[PDB]
Amino acid sequence: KSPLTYAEALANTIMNTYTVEELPPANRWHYHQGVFLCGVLRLWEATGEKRYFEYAKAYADLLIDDNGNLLFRRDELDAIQAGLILFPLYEQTKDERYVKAAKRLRSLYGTLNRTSEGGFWHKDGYPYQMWLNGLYMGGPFALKYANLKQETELFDQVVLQESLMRKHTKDAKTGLFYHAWDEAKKMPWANEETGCSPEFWARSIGWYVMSLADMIEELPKKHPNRHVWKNTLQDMIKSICRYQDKETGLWYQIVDKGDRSDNWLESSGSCLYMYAIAKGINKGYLDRAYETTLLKAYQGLIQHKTETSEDGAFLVKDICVGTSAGFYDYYVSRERSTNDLHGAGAFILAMTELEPLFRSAGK
Ligand SMILES: C[C@@H]1O[C@@H](O)[C@H](O[C@H]2OC(C(=O)O)=C[C@H](O)[C@H]2O)[C@H](O)[C@H]1O
Incomplete structure (x- = not known):
């Protein structure tokens, strides 16, 4: 039951499942x-x-x-x-x-199209749309590169992208961030007033918090965003934990609607929150009091979402497949897959940040 034990179990299962030539896609x-x-x-x-x-x-x-x-x-x-x-x-x-x-x-950053304020389009096929997932896809890489090549321009880039996303998708009421924002307000899911998608989809927010948790340490010392991101993370984590499943300790596909019978507990999102919380605690961004929430999620994760097959393969179920921006019914209807790479990556990553806390628990 030590975090790394499960991490290796799942890792070996995936590697035995696919050669690198088969690793999907x-x-x-x-x-x-x-x-x-x-x-x-x-x-x-x-x-x-x-x-x-x-x-x-x-x-x-x-x-x-x-x-x-x-x-x-x-x-x-x-x-x-x-x-x-x-x-x-x-x-x-x-x-x-x-x-x-x-x-x-x-070199791609300079070729991508942007919103009027400079936010990257998620893809050419999604004009003027910023999706939370994008922060993880393009943020951390930019900072790692910035430090490797001493290109400070990239620090400003990530700071801008993150501020534009928070500005347009953060919900004052709950503290949660909407999955996507369409500056053009052309998409059917774009709120006529805010331009935001309608739901708080777990993994999208999960990508965002894991990003903040990992990017803070990449900023130069004294950087203005070391405090901006730490504070943003604390508020998001606070908001997120308010919706943790009391019974399983996990989180729902649509975060704030656990009561709905068509909703369900999703694994990859839960793991991403576990990663951001553990990471936040280890780096001193979050109060160590969150350790209980974290250990409770770990317990429920293993207990309700994992099992070993008759053949000895470690399986993580209820991992939502690749998903786009949309409506409530679309989100809850997403295919639940076992050992989908979205979830396997999130699971293993979470175990690596959890281990340390697991071993120092009680000290
Ligand atoms: C090409 C496919 O595009 C979408 O269907 C998915 O990718 C989107 O969804 C997710 C996600 O975490 O579910 C992350 C990406 O940022 C977003 O573009 C599929 O995964 C893609 O293969």
Whole structure:
């Protein structure tokens, strides 16, 4: 029941399930594998087991050639996320192929379309729409690159993107942030007055809090946002925990509507909150009192969402598949999948930040 034990169990199950050539979407550079591999590389640093490092490197090498060339969806913030695996790979090998690949992804920022205030469109196919998920897809990578190449322009970039998102999607009443915002107000889900989508979808908010929790330490010392983001995170975590499931300790697909019978407890979102809370506590951004909420979620997660198959495979169920911006009925109707990379990555990542607290609990 130690966090890392489950993390390795799930990691090995996924790796045994897919060769790096099969890791879905097969032979594509995408954030599905990106988040899972970020988890795998984090587990590597925590255990020192070379095969976690080698598996991640295998996927990178399948897509990045001898000259650092990489094929990717050029209009999506989503394409940048996997770039996060390039930093630990480069730091360990010093192979310039990874820095060259990272530069191709970093060069995308200047080619992307933006809203009138400068917020990146989530994709070319989603004109003038900012989705919370985008903060994680393009934020952390930008800061990691900023520190690697001493390009301060990227600090301002992330600060702007984050402020624009919070400004347009944060709900005063609940403290939760709406999934998406359409400056053009052309999408059917765009509120005629605010331009926001109608629901608080767990994972989207989860991507946001994990981002804040990880990006604070990347900012230069004394940076104005070290305090802005810490405070934003405290308020969001406070808001989020107000909706934790009293019985299971988990969170619902649609955060603020757990009473509805068509709603349900979703795994990846819960894990992302667990990660942000654990991370926040370890870095001193959140009151250590949150440890109980965290350990309660861990208990419910393992108890209600995990099991081992007759064959010995560790399974995490109720992970929502890739999802777009929409209405309530669309969100609750999303396919629930077992070991979907969205959830596997979130699960493993959460276990790596949880472990430390788990071992110092009571001290
Ligand atoms: C190409 C597919 O586009 C969407 O269906 C999904 O990606 C979106 O949803 C999510 C998510 O966390 O569910 C994250 C991305 O930021 C967003 O673009 C699929 O995952 C994509 O494969």
